[PDB]
Ligand binder design. Structure first.
Ligand SMILES: C=Cc1ccccc1CS(=O)(=O)N1CCC[C@H](C(N)=O)C1
Ligand SMILES: C=Cc1ccccc1CS(=O)(=O)N1CCC[C@H](C(N)=O)C1
Ligand SMILES: [Zn+2]
Length: 139
């Protein structure tokens, strides 16, 4: 689990969004596994606006942060699950690293700020949904 809080927005994995997230929906995209809802309280996370391919992510299943090299956001095949059929998930960045299902929501950060959130994994890989292209998160 996990979310990004920036301005009056909350960014979560779309498959983990709550009833409250859907009742205050701003934008959602199944192809990206992202949902943004509106908040009452002001958020203070900074979003990275860069092309970094290295950063640090939080891994809940190990209670630890790990440094990773990751691919640029792209279309990646994701196997069927209880939330989606087999599909290409867009804006996804992959890295070699540990992840388990409950790791979704962990933040990936570079020196400029928040890059994305854990969204996929398995077989020694971890995939992050990018948020750096969502320029409207700051306005
Ligand atoms: C293996 C799980 C997994 C983890 C994270 C993401 C996706 C998978 C499924 S994959 O491994 O088949 N694969 C990752 C590399 C790019 C492949 C492709 N798109 O042709 C899809
Ligand atoms: C960090 C996740 C993870 C790690 C290791 C094993 C399994 C997972 C979960 S998953 O990658 O199979 N996943 C199920 C939920 C919806 C996700 C999506 N973005 O479509 C895909
Ligand atoms: Zn950066």
């Amino acid at each position: 689990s996990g979310a990004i809080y920036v301005g009056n927005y909350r960014v979560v994995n779309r498959h983990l969004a709550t009833h409250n997230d859907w009742a205050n929906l701003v934008w959602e995209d199944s192809s990206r596994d992202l949902l943004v809802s509106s908040t009452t309280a002001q958020g203070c996370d900074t979003i990275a606006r860069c092309d970094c391919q290295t950063g640090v992510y939080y891994c809940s299943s190990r209670r630890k942060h790990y440094p990773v090299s990751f691919s640029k956001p792209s279309l990646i095949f994701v196997e069927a699950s209880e939330y989606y059929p087999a599909r290409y998930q867009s804006h996804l960045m992959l890295a070699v690293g540990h992840s388990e299902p409950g790791d979704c929501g962990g933040i990936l950060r570079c020196q400029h700020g928040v890059v994305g959130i854990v969204s996929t994994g398995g077989n020694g890989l971890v995939g992050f949904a990018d948020v750096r292209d969502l320029l409207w998160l700051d306005e």
